[PDB]
């Protein structure tokens, strides 16, 4: 991969791994989401940074992902080359914002797009901190100045506000826990594997006859290794679902999201 | 990647990714695993298989792995290059050996090394089968003629009898199911999940002190969508060693069992 010629942005070629697809022989949305995060890993290694922290490494904080949006048009197959941009821009003193495009490298047509809202947080008290006024500068040589918005259109999907499902949910799955290969190198929960948690409580026969379109996901507290998950899924509705990870246990939310699918 | 200048073999480069890699920063042994087959699928395509034949798709038949065998020597670290040559090899009608070499792509050095069985079976009635000799014909021109092995040592582990853990066991975890992400394109769980779930017995005290040199891994039966497992460790052994049991959390029935030896950091 590497930064585009105003240095603004980051672009990275994949092709797409026999491991790596789903029943349709297309890349999952996993897959899409994993591939997501390493090119934002390698944007910020090409300019100089680390949980992506500049001189916050003193002071203990770092940047969490607050909210993932996802929307796919087509799913790219085993084989194809996909290429991805992404771009970080600053939205004042709640955090930071990270966009990307997909496009199909052969035909170069937008096959997908993906938003992310980031917070700064203290990695030991876990508290939320409003983003400096030095920390702000430290970034902004590295983001476009003017706006340049993956999802532009003004109130979209990716800024909707998601209600918390109501028991008795429609479907569920129980009972899941993470394993070592859910983790990442700093032994935390991938946010990735939250995303399979909350598409598992998604009956078969819809994952068999409709294709995923879109994806919003609130990260509201973090898994531990040691902690049990329950995913609830409820149809609101192409199809929609509304859902909630929480603690098997005392029901302690996690995440809460929704999902837009298409008939095949 | 590509096969060599012989055809007889293929290789192929990888950059290893920020979430391929463990706590030390260095990719997984899942990760490796994971490389393993998609190298192996490649060398398939390139010279035009499925792994399957046209005479074994109309007689319902297939591959499947009865054991794997890898030893690292070096875990390839986040942004290293990592290039990996595999090849098949016909062994008379008990069925086929897949072998790689993992070398680093800057040095040149062998940073590992992988053997596995395979056999032919029945995709319907799950029966084996010893193989035929038009079929054996079809694959010949793929593979060298003179033995080449990854592990040609006199008394080498990927050949060992693996023995069935007794109860109780040393250390468990219970209740792993798979989920989507663990499926591979046919909806079958995927090898290398088996893998995970063998190692998720090991007590995190051995995986923050040691790193996994080696792991033989024998597939019994296999493990449904709906099904739930049981992970079995006992220590048998500065070196240490494990013997390793994978059954379903209801009956106890058998789908894997195992050796893993360790080394300290
Ligand atoms: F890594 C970067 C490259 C260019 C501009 C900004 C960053 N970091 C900010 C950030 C927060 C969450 N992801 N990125
Ligand atoms: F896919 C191949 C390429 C070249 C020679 C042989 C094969 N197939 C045999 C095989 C692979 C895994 N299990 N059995």
Redesign the pocket.
């Given at each position: 991969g590497s930064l585009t010629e105003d240095g603004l942005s980051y672009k990275e070629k994949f092709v797409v791994r026999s491991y790596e697809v789903g029943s349709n022989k297309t890349a999952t949305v996993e897959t899409i989401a994993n591939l997501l995060q390493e090119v934002?890993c390698n944007?910020?290694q090409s300019?100089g940074?680390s949980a992506?922290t500049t001189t916050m490494r003193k002071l203990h904080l770092i940047?969490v992902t607050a909210r993932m949006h996802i929307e796919i048009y087509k799913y790219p197959a085993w084989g194809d080359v996909v290429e991805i941009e992404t771009w970080?821009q600053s939205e004042g003193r709640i955090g930071?914002r990270?966009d990307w495009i997909l496009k199909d490298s052969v035909t170069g047509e937008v096959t997908g797009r993906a938003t992310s809202k980031?917070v700064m947080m203290n990695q030991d008290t876990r508290r939320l901190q409003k983003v400096s006024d030095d920390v702000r500068d430290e970034?902004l040589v590295?983001?476009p100045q003017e706006p340049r918005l993956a999802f532009p259109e003004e109130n979209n999907r990716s800024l909707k506000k998601i209600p918390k499902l109501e028991d008795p949910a429609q479907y569920s799955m129980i009972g899941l826990k993470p394993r070592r290969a859910d983790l990442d190198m700093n032994q935390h929960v991938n946010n990735v594997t939250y995303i399979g948690w909350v598409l598992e409580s998604i009956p078969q026969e819809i994952v068999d006859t409709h294709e995923l379109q879109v994806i919003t996901l609130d990260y509201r507290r973090e898994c531990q290794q040691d902690d049990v998950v329950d995913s609830l899924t409820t149809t609101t509705s192409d199809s929609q679902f509304l859902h909630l990870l929480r603690l098997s246990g005392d029901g302690q939310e996690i995440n809460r999201g929704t999902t837009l699918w298409r008939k095949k």
């Open positions: 934002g944007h910020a300019v940074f992506t940047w970080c930071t990270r980031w970034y590295f983001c």
